[PDB]
């Protein structure tokens, strides 16, 4: 259990990308071989920056106004808002001469460009600009203008009763005028490209042929390190014996590394069989039907230790037709059930999800009610466990989730 074993152990504890990193990185030190034109098509997408630049050209400004504008549009973000500030642009242009209204003048015309309200100044001038745009024949333009001007702080509380006595408005009529503001649909910069590229973590594969799915690793992902037969034979006929020692050392380390790697692969596959042997239930039925598993149970299965499996299963991924999942995800705690049995936490989690999703949306169910329901089904859990499982699933509120009945 010296150095060689030591390094072989850190070999399986890490993800496959850092594994290939170290493998390839250490494949340059010792001779151990691993083993319709240029542009695919090429297309230059436009985007809400180039589209704002297009308009600048067409429009008539002077040589000085043109620069200001270039600078302004640089500050525009994906959301649609001038990023910095008004005076900031004046201070960044380095010329003390140019007035602060100079930029305003330009900036007062750039924000009626394509999406109007682009390059707004702090998520409010948008409405002002957007409203001034359409005609004055709209029913409650006065009222809405007055609201937006100085009375947004009050609107923030989603309150309407206070707005009557503050700004001298009518009885609920403003409310219909407040709906006009709701239809404004701010942030016209976010008309951006929804070109979010696709992501993946493929590692081991599970496929369901003739019942009893068989687990087998990826054909391409897994790295195969072989030895050179060419440099092997070259050690016996070496001259200075320095050469020979060099080649012997390279050779022995290579064999070592090879075996280590293989050992990793074999261990991964073995741990990829046990789970499938234990958890056929999950791949067939779902999260609702998972059985609990511990490291100690997997080590006891096939001549294994806890410590060893603990490292294999860290940052490892499995693709099944159910989905893509980490191996660490399968292992979870258990609770005492009816008839001496043990129920997995994932089953209770899916049950809580499906129970909250199918509850009456008019009046929400309290955690105590859910605890009582679960006890009636034969699960026998506390209110704290239910609270934790509910909070864990990006649901802080239980009773605050109340919509219009």
């Amino acid at each position: 259990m010296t150095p060689q074993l030591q390094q072989a152990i850190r070999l399986l504890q890490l993800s496959t990308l850092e594994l290939q990193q170290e493998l390839q990185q250490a494949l340059e030190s010792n001779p151990l071989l691993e083993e319709e034109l240029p542009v695919y098509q090429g297309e230059t997408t436009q985007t809400l920056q180039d589209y704002l630049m297009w308009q600048v050209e067409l429009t008539p400004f002077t040589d000085t106004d043109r620069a200001i504008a270039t600078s302004i549009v640089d500050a525009v973000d994906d959301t649609g808002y001038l990023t910095i500030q008004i005076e900031d642009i004046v201070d960044s242009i380095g010329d003390d001469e140019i007035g602060l209204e100079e930029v305003e003048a330009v900036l007062k015309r750039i924000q009626r460009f394509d999406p109007v309200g682009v390059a707004a100044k702090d998520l409010r001038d948008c409405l002002l600009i957007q409203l001034s745009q359409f005609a004055k024949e709209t029913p409650w333009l006065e009222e809405a203008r007055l609201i937006i001007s100085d009375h947004l702080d009050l609107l923030a509380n989603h309150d309407f009763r206070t707005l009557m006595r503050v700004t001298r408005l009518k009885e609920e009529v403003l409310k219909e005028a407040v709906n006009l503001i709701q239809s404004l649909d701010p942030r016209p910069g976010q008309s951006i490209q929804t070109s979010e590229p696709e992501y993946v973590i493929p590692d081991v594969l599970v496929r369901k042929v003739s019942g009893r799915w068989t687990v087998e690793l990826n054909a391409d992902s897994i790295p195969r390190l072989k030895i050179n037969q060419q440099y092997a034979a070259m050690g016996n006929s070496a001259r200075n014996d320095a050469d020979g020692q060099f080649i012997r050392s390279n050779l022995q380390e290579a064999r070592w590394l090879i075996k280590s790697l293989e050992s990793r692969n074999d261990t991964l596959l073995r741990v990829s069989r046990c789970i499938v042997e234990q958890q056929q239930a999950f791949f067939e039925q779902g999260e609702e039907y998972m059985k609990p598993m511990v490291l100690a149970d997997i080590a006891q299965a096939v001549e294994m230790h806890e410590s060893t499996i603990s490292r294999v299963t860290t940052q490892k991924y499995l693709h099944s037709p159910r989905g893509i999942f980490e191996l660490k995800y399968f292992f979870s705690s258990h609770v005492n059930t009816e008839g001496g049995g043990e129920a997995s936490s994932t089953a209770i989690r899916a049950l809580v999800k499906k129970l909250i999703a199918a509850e009456n949306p008019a009046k929400p169910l309290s955690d105590s009610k859910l605890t009582s329901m679960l006890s009636e089904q034969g699960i026998m859990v506390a209110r704290r466990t239910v609270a934790k499982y509910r909070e864990s699933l990006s649901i802080p509120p239980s009773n605050q989730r109340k919509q219009l009945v």
């Binding site: 340059e28 030190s29 001779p31 240029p38 542009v39 695919y40 090429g42 590229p197 696709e198 992501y199 993946v200 440099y231 070259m234 070496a238 050469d243 060099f246 080649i247």
Partner: protein, 201 residues
Amino acid sequence: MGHIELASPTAHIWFLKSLPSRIGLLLDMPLRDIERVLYFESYVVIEGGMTNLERQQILTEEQYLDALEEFGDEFDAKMGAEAIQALLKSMDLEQECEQLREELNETNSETKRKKLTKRIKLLEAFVQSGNKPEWMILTVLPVLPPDLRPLVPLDGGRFATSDLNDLYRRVINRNNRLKRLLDLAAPDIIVRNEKRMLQEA
């Protein structure tokens, strides 16, 4: 753009491989010998002052092996790409041009009229051009801007960058391995094979 050191004075492929042997016209060496030197299977001599040998004579591995003990260490020979570099740098343009002109003016014959004036014209055109002969090889290798070579996204996260960057990464890793092996004083056969593979790449 960029640049790669390559850790070795490799030669260019457009020369010595086209219809006219441009590396052969300056060195007066046949194409077979020049191609055999670059692949570490010739081990041509560089320069010998006291040794009974020609300046640009052809040699072999066994010949050098059983002749090293004869003349001692006076015979300087190189089997890599630096051999042609040295043979081309240790050559004066005007000193050879004067001899060629004297031979063409004094000895006038049928065979002397042809295959000799072309060399003089080539030497004159190369001298008047101001270019250096040793620059025919690329000690430093520049690369083209990456904007001209996109990632080529075929389907999903396909960033293989094939047909234009595979050769680049191959040459880069080959140069890195060659430098790593040279930093540790690797044996001669291994580094010669590595340099041959880098030249091929």
